[PDB]
Design a protein around this ligand. Structure first.
Ligand SMILES: Nc1ncnc2c1ncn2[C@@H]1O[C@H](C[C@@H](N)CC[C@H](N)C(=O)O)[C@@H](O)[C@H]1O
Ligand SMILES: Nc1ncnc2c1ncn2[C@@H]1O[C@H](C[C@@H](N)CC[C@H](N)C(=O)O)[C@@H](O)[C@H]1O
Ligand SMILES: [Cl-]
Ligand SMILES: [Cl-]
Ligand SMILES: [Cl-]
Lengths: 258, 258
């Protein structure tokens, strides 16, 4: 017999829409960018709560998963760090001498990444072709790292983002996107049945970030297998060229069909 | 104006009352008791979200605030670790050779502290006289650490707890309770007006823990001064004998009236 805990908040004393991720990254950088300074708190639409240390977004390349290290190791040409956050991936390439630009819709994340030394365009992925200034791009390499394939969202959201990237892609461009290939545990079974009731696609969660009295917008998130990634590319301008696995993580190389 | 985010949750898919603190401590111990394993997420009743690393409850004595180190160094006799959590304080005293017993109302916290090597009675503070086994007590030293004076709650709640501790106290027993002497923090000015609208005591926050789908019950939390503490002690069996400060933190010694 479950006992509902009830919701916090009341008119005039409730969480408000804002930029919690930017605020968390800023507080983390304020203290040096090390561990146990600020924390990313994620809330699912059933109230499921999970947190992690924001210091992961400032870690050097030596502390990344191998899939992320491979991607930055092989990036060539003009690079766009898609969803750069604090810019940890694009910064490693900027040190190496590459021409790197980042894009992120979080104003606080954009400012933090610029402070660390990365040029960042503050825009949604779907606004990339319209807001990309002259002289920027086209890009030979797109970084989609930090479970970037899961950041793409539901199939309709993913195809829209992939279309905007192709609009600013150079001939022969590649997307270096990492992901996770894990079996669905039985804990999500209740949540997965909730998705089927609401007509939502399987495998995805609807989550948002929480910090202080600030809340982000709901967005869809998942861990996408390489096979499901290949399916979402059917009919788009990208082919799944290769998949390199590091245990349960993988690095997918998407090649532009032009 | 700012847009409210709206709460999450639905029947059968909503946060439930449970033991999130026990789950967090369990997840931290299972990983080795280090940092960046599990995180304690706290939600105020207006939705204000903060988090911290659960590794603090497994920290060595050198990492404790100085007020906690002072209390542990001078503990003597039969010791009761009041609200022991993962038992870091009582464990150090048992390593030093003292007869220590912990008490905590979280079943998972009690189970974690037992696995670490501390005897724990699962009980609420006011249940201590009824649930204390025959072979335990009376106690010469009560540990009330980790802002233990703020955990006492409102004056009515604090006096009930202090009365229960007195029932199981040896003649001349002392309570080593640490606290925070912080002036009115400007960041809680609006929340304090909410307290006044609702007729709640000044200086308190109504908070709860969130982890996964589990939620703790609401409880009152404060940072009370030694002067406020002495006021609460008026009419009790305890006298404020000394106060030792370490910046905003202090360690109060409460002696049992004969
Ligand atoms: N539709 C979108 N348009 C632009 N930026 C987005 C969008 N969705 C998410 N983001 C950003 O992408 C970032 C995702 C974060 N997990 C950081 C990922 C980053 N690559 C890292 O691992 O350090 C956040 O900073 C978001 O603000
Ligand atoms: N009324 C109560 N009765 C018994 N235990 C309680 C009560 N209120 C809070 N607690 C416990 O006290 C602990 C509070 C912790 N934040 C502190 C743990 C420990 N004192 C430490 O500093 O590491 C939690 O484990 C709660 O489960
Ligand atoms: Cl909902
Ligand atoms: Cl550690
Ligand atoms: Cl147990």
């Amino acid at each position: 017999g479950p006992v509902p805990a009830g919701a916090a908040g009341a008119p005039g004393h409730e969480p408000l829409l804002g930029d919690p991720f930017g605020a968390v990254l800023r507080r983390c950088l304020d203290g040096g960018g090390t561990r146990d300074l600020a924390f990313e708190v994620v809330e699912r639409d059933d109230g499921f709560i999970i947190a992690q240390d924001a210091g992961i977004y400032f870690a050097p390349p030596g502390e990344w998963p191998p899939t992320e290290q491979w991607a930055v190791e092989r990036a060539r040409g003009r690079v766009l760090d898609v969803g750069c956050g604090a810019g940890r991936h694009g910064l490693a390439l900027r040190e190496a001498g590459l021409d790197v630009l980042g894009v992120d819709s979080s104003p606080g994340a954009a400012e933090v990444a610029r402070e660390r030394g990365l040029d960042v365009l503050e825009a949604r992925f779907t606004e990339l072709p319209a807001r990309l200034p002259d002289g920027a791009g086209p890009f030979d390499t797109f970084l989609l790292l930090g479970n970037g394939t899961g950041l793409l969202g539901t199939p309709a959201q993913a195809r829209e983002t992939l279309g905007a990237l192709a609009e600013v892609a150079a001939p022969g461009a590649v997307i270096l996107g990492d992901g996770l290939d894990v079996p669905v545990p039985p804990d999500r079974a209740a949540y997965e049945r909730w998705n089927a009731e609401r007509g939502r696609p399987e495998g995805f969660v609807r989550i948002r970030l929480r910090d202080r009295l600030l809340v982000g917008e709901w967005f869809d998130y998942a861990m996408i297998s390489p096979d499901d990634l290949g399916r979402v590319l059917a009919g788009t301008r990208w082919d799944l060229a290769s998949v390199e696995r590091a245990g349960v993580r993988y690095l997918a190389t998407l090649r532009l069909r032009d």
